[PDB]
């Protein structure tokens, strides 16, 4: 019975490809060719955060655009103050192999996880002033790659078992699951409406899911290698993905087709992180060539190059107000660009 | 010159820095190893012998000659080491266990070894090879019902080296078989590396304890190699 299922699936995907191609009347390069370029953009290292013992693997900005969180492979989460360069908090972890971290929008909780298959959530504001483990969500069979907060009692996690999950922090039980991927989910990205989220797997594919339904809303393909990081557009109708083929791909949610591509002959290294600015004109991407590149989202041109790291760039983040950009590499150092 | 909150935050940051400096002394004195190996290799016996001194990763801490060694072994991973293998790029050594008694997996073990030796992020990490279950291989090659040339044609042209120094009272056929199995991994390893890391093959039988010493010595040599790169002596 599989013989007819295969041909049915292939004719369905051919029909989908034809319906997607029928809507492609003009490329984005043909629409924004008359737009003046952004010129040359140069940024300098404003501050350098040191203190980590092992390589830095994760980093996320808060809602106040002042505090920052970083995760090191020695089993340490460090919350820094970006304005005063002082260390606000230091939390030791149970497992040293942490691969992701998250900061709650209210600033009360901090989530982390990794090769221990357990998502540890710590509380920052305690009655005694000391940071303690608030909860340990277990149940996954693979390593955790990314986690993001929806609210004070809901957390979206991505594991290496080709599935994503949404957990209730107040209860501790898995609220819902998202299945369908054929590879390890590598990154997550929440929409501004906190109702849709994209997740890319190690199969050159990504899927947009709805939080309130738990079913696959949309699927996107086009890459040639595994996708490592995905970032949503500020408007909520587009998203950029980066893979190991040294090429970024910006898709839109309404047209369901590859909209923009970013590549160069002198770039043959993998991509580790992607992020947008407030306006959405600049796209920052960290590569394995020890440097980061800021491309023009509307013209696919190299607008700027940020160098200064001695090892592979691991994480890159942009503040909510777009004032500074945090970069973290395997050199155990954090850099602030502006 | 500053408010009370500012100096309080400065004192808190200084205390956090002192705590980090105190933890660094304990962190830098512990050697971290990564244990790798497929099924039916004998990793459980090795770890249960070394412990005499849904979890994700199993951690085994043991002290040898006042030196602390923490070995991390893979747990509930779904047999996909393409992505999470990069997190172990700063380990001291990778102890790779290979079952030399099962021929049908030996070549597969090669496919598991070479990819590790030619990894882009594992070019500066030493690999200690443990060929486990030597008695099973010995009894199999003495039984005469399993021919190695059926899976490796070059074994038909392989001979015992002149510098062979086996243990007193060992069969020459089992010695030639063990030396061929070791030379396979040696040729796979020496194909690249450029002297950045060396492979240390060892013959274990999962019923001996001195292996726990061997690794130690090997680790020492690894550190020695690091010293050779610090003083610009090589």
């Amino acid at each position: 019975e599989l013989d007819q299922l295969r041909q049915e699936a292939e004719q369905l995907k051919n029909q989908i490809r034809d319906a997607r191609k029928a809507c492609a009347d003009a490329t984005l390069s043909q629409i924004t060719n008359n737009i003046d370029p952004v010129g040359r953009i140069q940024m300098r290292t404003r501050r350098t955060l040191r203190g980590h013992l092992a390589k830095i693997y994760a980093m996320h900005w808060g809602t106040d655009s002042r505090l920052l969180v970083s995760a090191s492979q020695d089993g340490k989460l460090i919350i820094w103050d970006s304005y005063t360069t002082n260390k606000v908090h230091a939390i030791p972890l149970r497992s040293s192999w942490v691969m992701t971290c998250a900061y709650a929008p209210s600033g009360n909780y901090v989530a982390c996880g990794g090769l221990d298959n357990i998502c540890s959530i710590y509380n920052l504001k305690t009655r005694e002033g000391n940071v303690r483990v608030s909860r340990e969500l277990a149940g996954h069979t693979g390593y955790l790659s990314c986690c993001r907060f929806l609210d004070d009692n809901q957390i979206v996690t991505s594991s290496g078992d080709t599935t994503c999950a949404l957990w209730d922090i107040e209860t501790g039980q898995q609220t819902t699951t998202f299945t369908g991927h054929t590879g390890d989910v590598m990154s997550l990205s929440l929409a501004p409406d906190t109702r849709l989220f994209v997740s890319g797997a190690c199969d050159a594919s990504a899927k947009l899911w709805d939080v309130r339904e738990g079913m696959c809303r949309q699927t996107f393909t086009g890459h040639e290698s595994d996708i490592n990081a995905i970032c949503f557009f500020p408007n909520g109708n587009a998203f950029a993905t980066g893979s190991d083929d040294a090429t970024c791909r910006l898709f839109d949610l309404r047209a369901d087709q590859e909209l923009m591509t970013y590549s160069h002959d002198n770039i043959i290294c993998g991509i580790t992180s992607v992020s947008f600015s407030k306006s959405g004109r600049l796209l920052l991407a960290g590569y394995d060539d020890f440097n980061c590149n800021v491309w023009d989202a509307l013209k696919a041109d190299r607008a700027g190059v940020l160098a200064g790291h001695d090892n592979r760039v691991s994480c890159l983040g942009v503040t909510d107000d777009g004032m500074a950009v945090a970069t973290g590499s395997w050199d155990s150092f954090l850099k602030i660009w502006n | 010159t500053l408010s009370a909150e500012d100096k309080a935050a400065v004192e808190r940051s200084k205390m956090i820095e002192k705590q980090l400096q105190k933890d660094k002394q304990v962190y830098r004195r512990t050697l971290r190893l990564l244990l790798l190996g497929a099924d039916n290799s004998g990793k459980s016996t090795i770890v249960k012998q070394m412990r005499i001194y849904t979890s994700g990763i199993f951690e085994t801490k043991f002290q040898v000659d006042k030196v602390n060694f923490h070995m991390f072994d893979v747990g509930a991973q779904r047999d996909e080491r393409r992505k999470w293998i990069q997190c172990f790029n700063d380990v001291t050594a990778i102890i790779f266990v290979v079952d030399s008694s099962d021929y049908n997996r030996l070549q597969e073990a090669l496919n598991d070894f070479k990819s590790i030796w030619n990894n882009r992020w594992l070019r500066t990490i030493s690999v200690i090879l443990f060929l486990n279950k030597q008695d099973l291989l010995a009894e199999k090659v003495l039984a005469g019902k399993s021919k190695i040339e059926d899976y490796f044609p070059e074994f038909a042209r392989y001979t015992t080296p002149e510098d062979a120094t086996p243990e007193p009272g060992e069969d020459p056929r089992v010695t030639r078989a063990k030396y061929f199995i070791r030379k396979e991994f040696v040729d796979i390893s020496t194909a690249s590396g450029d002297g950045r890391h060396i492979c240390y093959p060892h013959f274990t039988c999962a019923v001996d304890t001195e292996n726990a010493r061997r690794i130690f010595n090997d680790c020492k040599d690894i550190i020695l190699q690091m010293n050779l790169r610090e003083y610009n002596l090589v």
Partner: nanobody
Framework: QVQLQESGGGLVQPGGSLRLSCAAS????????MNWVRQAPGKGLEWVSD????????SYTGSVKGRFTISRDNAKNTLYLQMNSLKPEDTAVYYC?????????????????????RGQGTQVTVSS
């Protein structure tokens, strides 16, 4: 999408020859290392051969040395595998696998049970 279509299988007599063809689509074929893997009925996945991007550094497993030969044509993006002197123990499903990362010398998880960058495979039966 990464598509790898295999063809050229079927049932043949022992001692014959076959020519398996692997057609790639959706990526640059001249930049990824290719391999041919085998899965026996009732057994696990066993790697057979592999070839790099340019066409050199070809390697085979010990059980197929001297009998199978793999080549690649980048002008048409095709992977050919000529199989001579077939034995009755070679009846199995052949898969055309691709290297996960380009411009590399190491390809991990090419023999995984649920690897994504592989085709459906072709059946090769060797009997009367």
């Amino acid at each position: 999408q990464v598509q790898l279509q295999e063809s050229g299988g079927g049932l043949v007599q022992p001692g014959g020859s076959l020519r398996l063809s692997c057609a790639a689509s959706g990526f640059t074929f001249s930049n990824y290392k290719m391999n041919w893997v085998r899965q026996a009925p009732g057994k696990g996945l066993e790697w057979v051969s592999d070839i790099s991007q340019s066409g050199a550094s070809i390697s085979y497993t010990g059980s197929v040395k001297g009998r199978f030969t793999i080549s690649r044509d980048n002008a048409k993006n095709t992977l050919y595998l000529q199989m001579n002197s077939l034995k009755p123990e070679d009846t199995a499903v052949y898969y055309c696998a691709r290297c996960p990362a380009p411009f590399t010398r190491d390809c991990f998880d090419v023999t995984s049970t649920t690897y994504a960058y592989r085709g459906q495979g072709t059946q090769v039966t060797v009997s009367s």
